[PDB]
Amino acid sequence: KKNIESGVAHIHSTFNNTIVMITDTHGNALAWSSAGSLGFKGSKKSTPFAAQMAAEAATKVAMEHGLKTVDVTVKGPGSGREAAIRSLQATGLEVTAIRDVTPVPHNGCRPPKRRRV
């Protein structure tokens, strides 16, 4: 439907999870996934393999509506950010841009206590 054939992948990868949503060239979302929505639990949600299969479960649906063009904007200073890409290309999509979008404050707000573990 809508035979968009263009869009941009958003990767949001923290220390203990990983989300990949694929939306079109502007806003409105088409298909998403995350490691939790694949039965994984707890620790394992941060290994790259989780990002592998989540990228797959998103692509497989995004190209069930016609899609080649995609870019990659990676938030999320975590680990599996590149495994997400390697699964994004090698199951059909047409990656052509990588960019980093990490919020960097110019010293505005105060962060929480340091943990004494």
Q: Please identify, using beta-carbon distances, which residue of 3 and 41 lies nearer to RNA.
A: 41
Residue 40 per-residue DSSP state = -
Q: Does 75 bind RNA (CB under 7 A)?
A: yes
- Closest distance of CB 107 from RNA, Å: 4
Q: Please identify, using beta-carbon distances, which residue of 3 and 26 lies nearer to RNA.
A: 26
Task: Give the binding range for RNA (CB under 7 A) out of 18-26, 79-87, 90-98.
Answer: 18-26
Instruction: Return the residue of 99, 107, 112, 116 that touches RNA, per CB under 7 A.
Output: 107
Q: Please identify, using beta-carbon distances, which residue of 14 and 89 lies nearer to RNA.
A: 14
Torsion, CA 51, CA 4, CA 98, CA 26, rounded to 10: -100
Specify whether the CB–CB gap between 66 and 42 falls below 8 A: no
Q: What's the token pair of residue 39? A: 């039965």
Q: What's the token pair of residue 59? A: 């692509």
> Could you tell me which residues come within 8 angstroms of residue 98 by beta carbon, excluding any fewer than 6 positions away?
71, 72, 74, 85
- Closest distance of CB 115 from RNA, Å: 7
If 0-12 CB within 10 Å is exposed, 13-18 middle and 19+ buried, where does residue 105 land?
exposed
Instruction: Return the residue of 43, 112, 113, 114 that touches RNA, per CB under 7 A.
Output: 43
Q: Please identify, using beta-carbon distances, which residue of 61 and 95 lies nearer to RNA.
A: 61
